[PDB]
A and B are shown apart, each in its own frame.
Chain A
Amino acid sequence: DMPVERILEAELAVDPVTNICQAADKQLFTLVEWAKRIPHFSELPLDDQVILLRAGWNELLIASFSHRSIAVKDGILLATGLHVHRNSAHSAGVGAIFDRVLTELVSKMRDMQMDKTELGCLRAIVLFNPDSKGLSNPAEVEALREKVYASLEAYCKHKYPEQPGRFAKLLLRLPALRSIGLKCLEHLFFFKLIGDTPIDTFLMEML
């Protein structure tokens, strides 16, 4: 069982480089509390819970700050309340991936007015990633993923029957999120390699 109500409840319950790192470290503690509120996540083996969050944390944070930023003009609102605009993104060397977040995620979430239940379900789908390496029983994760997207489709079809393509439109933002998560992670590993990141943090562990 996988009720969209509980997925929405999980959502509602929770120098540029330094600003980005501080903001990611903060949201990693929050992301663990979100994951435990997703139905049946905490019933997986503990080592599989570790594997899923290591595989998806950066996509899960990117989805959230993208949805948070739909009302910001040409910028990204970080969870600390600080903004990232184009000037500072270029000074961090991440101008091109910044543009891709705006054009592939924020603007498209805005266009279709993606709501918070839909965001929560896409994030639960990312969380339940059955391709994560080393899972004790990948198919158990695929099973939960399938329950999430069954619930998402029924939700969209009830709330937005005039938009029959809406469910697929949501799922087809996931390749963009995967591209963009990979590139953000590359920059983060670089910041750490050259010694520009805060030390002794949860973020350092994830990297």
Chain B
Amino acid sequence: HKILHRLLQEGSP
């Protein structure tokens, strides 16, 4: 679930 797990995390450009 790499995409969802990343998307949920704050601090993205």
Contacts and interface: CB of A to CB of B under 8 A. Distances in A.
Interface of A: 29, 32, 35-36, 42, 46, 49-50, 53-54, 202, 205-206
B3 A50 contact: no
Interface of B: 1-5, 7-10
A186 to B, nearest CB: 21
B3 A202 contact: yes
Nearest to A206: B4
A36 B10 CA distance: 10
Given A50-B1, A50-B5, 17 more contacts: A32-B7, A35-B8, A36-B8, A42-B8, A42-B10, A46-B8, A46-B9, A49-B8, A50-B8, A53-B4, A53-B8, A54-B4, A202-B3, A202-B4, A205-B2, A205-B3, A205-B4
A133 B4 CA distance: 17
A54 B2 CA distance: 12
A170 to B, nearest CB: 28
Contact of B1 (A35, A36, A42, A54): A54
A202 B5 CA distance: 11
